[PDB]
Design a protein around this nucleic acid. Structure first.
Ligand SMILES: [Mg+2]
Ligand SMILES: [Mg+2]
Ligand SMILES: [Mg+2]
Ligand SMILES: [Mg+2]
Ligand SMILES: [Mg+2]
Ligand SMILES: [Mg+2]
Ligand SMILES: [Mg+2]
Lengths: 89, 110, 34, 121, 44
RNA sequence: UGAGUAGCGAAAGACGGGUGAGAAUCCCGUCCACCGAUUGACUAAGGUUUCCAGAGGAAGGCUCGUCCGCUCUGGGUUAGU
RNA sequence: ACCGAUAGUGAACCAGUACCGUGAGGGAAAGGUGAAAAGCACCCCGGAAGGGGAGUGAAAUAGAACCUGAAACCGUGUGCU
């Protein structure tokens, strides 16, 4: 059970900046630590992953009239590695 | 021929506009752009875009000459308001009534 | 210190006889920019 | 004379000293009517010290003219005090007083205030 | 001046949480009037 | 209606230049001036995306407004101590 | 031989909702284009809003606050005084 842990990448100006140091970015499910994440990439991609950081977010507020609704919640995984690379697009 | 033009939901009171129009009625046309831009008010720059729409449609839609062409009907009439509130000394509050107007010009030959 | 009555439609309008504005001068349109 | 301009003594003595200076640099400014009928006088009493040019007038041509503005005209640097005694004084060596000129533009948009120009001649 | 309702979060839940309404029968007749009337927010 | 009346919340600003359909009130620059065991700099409660960058000017801002803690759009909180 | 949008239910629509209160608990407002979207291609004034012509339609003084459209209140014109 790997391909339900991590979902999709984040391509930004910071995520594009960090690929000059082989730091890549993903958007992880909740309910998951950083050790479940480390052996996930390391068995899809065969990259010999290195250390990992993580964070959370909080609801924002989309609203366009009669739709006073909140939004889902995130948990990013700024990942790092030395030996190798992965081309995503 | 009698051309016209109307401006709609213009954000000024009528009682403030109606002071300028009395200086504009029953007069020539080029004897009005002058008296308008030599009157320090805030009404004047919006009654000036509203002649020049009634003069630029007596040239392309209805084919009259601007040489002799006078002003026969100008008037302002009330509109919808916008209710607001200002707080006061004690917990009480007080009304505010921000008002609007519609403007209407008519240019005619004889 | 408080109005005892209502102000009619006439007495409101008999009063504004002088509550108008005035016209600029007229030099040849040119301004009177002395 | 005797105009106060809604500004107490300690304020008016510093508003009429900035007007006298920044004028001289650019020789043409844009003010309200009242103020320029009062630098009509302050600045006309300030070239009359520049024709003497003596060592004493420079000492009373500094108690109203304003702190040393390190100008920069064409490839240079001046002071407003070594421009007033060298250059304006020399243009104006053979006239009597009356070297200012007021000119009426229109009013302003916000506060409805008569606006005028003032220059040198 | 100084006014009432100097907030906090320990004390807005130690006195009006869920688990203080359940531990007390008169607080279960509180809940059981807010489910029947139909409100989207039971006491927390 | 009262009525274009009472009021517009303690306090030093002036000129020049630039962008704009449009400037006392926005951006850059000069001098002057005030608070100063505070109108400084850090942290907690509590508040909960108000933070940042391009855009925008119907409403809100006790005036104006090309500007904004306001309106659209996409993005920003990284721990063996 | 019941109501027909101030009525009937607190709620015909976003309703036990927004909003008020530490809390228990209290409480609203708000329906209708046309038979048919055929929802005004194009030209002109203006920075945009809005208006004038053209054109769809049986009628646009039925143009998205759109079925009808009283009264208070606010105005332009002039037959006698
Ligand atoms: Mg004049
Ligand atoms: Mg007055
Ligand atoms: Mg009175
Ligand atoms: Mg500055
Ligand atoms: Mg900001
Ligand atoms: Mg009805
Ligand atoms: Mg019908």
């Amino acid at each position: 059970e790997a391909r339900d842990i991590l979902k999709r990448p984040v391509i930004t100006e910071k995520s594009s900046e960090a690929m000059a140091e082989d730091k890549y970015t993903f958007d992880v499910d909740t309910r998951v630590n950083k050790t479940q994440v480390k052996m996930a990439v390391e068995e899809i991609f065969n990259v010999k992953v290195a250390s990992v950081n993580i964070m959370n977010y909080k609801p924002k507020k989309k609203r366009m009239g009669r739709y006073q609704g909140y939004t889902n919640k995130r948990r990013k995984a700024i990942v790092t590695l030395k030996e190798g690379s992965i081309d995503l697009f | 021929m009698e051309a016209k033009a109307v401006a709609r939901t213009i954000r000024i009171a009528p009682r403030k506009v109606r002071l300028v129009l009395d200086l504009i009625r029953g007069k020539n046309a080029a004897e009005a752009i002058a008296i308008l831009k030599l009157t320090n008010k805030a009404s004047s720059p919006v009654i000036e875009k509203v002649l020049m729409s009634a003069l630029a449609n007596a040239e392309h839609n209805y084919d009259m000459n601007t040489d002799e062409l006078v002003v026969k009907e100008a008037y302002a009439n009330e509109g919808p308001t916008l209710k607001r509130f200002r707080p006061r000394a004690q917990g009480r509050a007080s009304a505010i009534n921000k008002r609007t107007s519609h403007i209407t010009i008519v240019v005619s030959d004889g | 210190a408080v109005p005892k009555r209502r102000t009619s439609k006439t007495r409101k309008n008999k009063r504004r006889t002088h509550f108008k504005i005035s016209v600029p001068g007229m030099t040849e349109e040119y301004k009177l920019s002395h | 004379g005797y105009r106060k301009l809604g500004r107490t003594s300690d304020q008016r003595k510093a508003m009429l000293r900035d007007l006298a200076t920044s004028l001289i640099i650019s020789e043409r400014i844009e003010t309200t009517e009242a103020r320029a009928k009062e630098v009509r006088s302050v600045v006309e009493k300030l070239i009359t010290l520049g024709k003497k040019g003596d060592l004493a007038s420079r000492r009373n041509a500094a108690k109203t003219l304003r702190n040393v503005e390190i100008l920069n005209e064409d490839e240079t640097t001046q002071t407003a005090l070594q421009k007033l005694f060298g250059e304006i004084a020399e243009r104006y060596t053979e006239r009597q007083g009356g070297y200012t000129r007021i000119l009426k533009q229109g009013p302003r948009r916000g506060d409805g205030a008569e606006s005028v120009i003032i220059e040198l001649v | 001046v100084k006014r009432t309702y100097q907030p906090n979060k320990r004390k807005h839940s130690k006195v009006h949480g869920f688990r203080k309404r359940m531990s007390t029968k008169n607080g279960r007749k509180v809940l059981a009037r807010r489910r029947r009337k139909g409100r989207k927010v039971l006491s927390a």
